[PDB]
């Protein structure tokens with residue numbers, strides 16, 4: 001069964017602001033998601049130092065960026081720690097509520113949307129460029145899940161029966177019609193170099209086709 005959930009009103013409000021604010025500097029979505037990847041790869045590596053079996057679902061620690069012009073998707077893939085169903089439905093939203101409030105106050109005081117990552121809610125910058133976001137994820141302790149949302153106040157979760165990933169997270173950005181620049185190899189390399197050049201994991205940019 002596909003389960004449908006309501007976001008918290010605060011998360012829904014942050015999502016509308018991201019969607020609705022005039023703000024040209026949309027490219028920062030990408031460092032935010034790569035930085036999320038990097039932090040998740042730090043967590044699995046750190047956990048595997050006192051428990052080596054945590055890497056039996058895959059030893060390689062890396063980030064892939066995969067454009068697809070036909071589907072109009074940019075996918076950010078990591079082999080980090082992954083997320084459990086409790087993360088997807090409850091834990092992450094509980095934390096997000098307070099980083100939301102702070103981010104919202106900061107914008108009023110004169111901060112801008114690019115600073116979102118400082119408030120633990122940078123994931124939502126995905127909606128600068130994406131009309132829908134699908135998150136596929138598998139943690140050692142749980143099953144493989146698909147989370148999805150096009151904003152509008154709700155998200156769904158379901159067991160994922162697609163191709164098993166081992167361990168880690170794929171964020172599939174279904175791009176808005178006017179943001180297909182983020183599918184172009186030269187544009188992605190530009191942004192990675194500008195904002196993500198010191199990530200301590202190999203980042204592979206796949207090419208089409």
Ligand SMILES: C#CCCCn1c(Cc2cc(OC)c(OC)c(OC)c2Cl)nc2c(N)nc(F)nc21
Nearest residue numbers: 036037040080081082083092096120123135147169
């Ligand atoms: C916030 C925060 C950090 C943790 C959640 N998270 C994120 C950000 C994120 C935050 C969310 O709530 C604030 C969130 O819920 C809608 C979310 O949804 C699937 C993601 Cl991917 N990306 C990763 C990732 N690549 N890998 C792992 F393992 N965890 C991740």
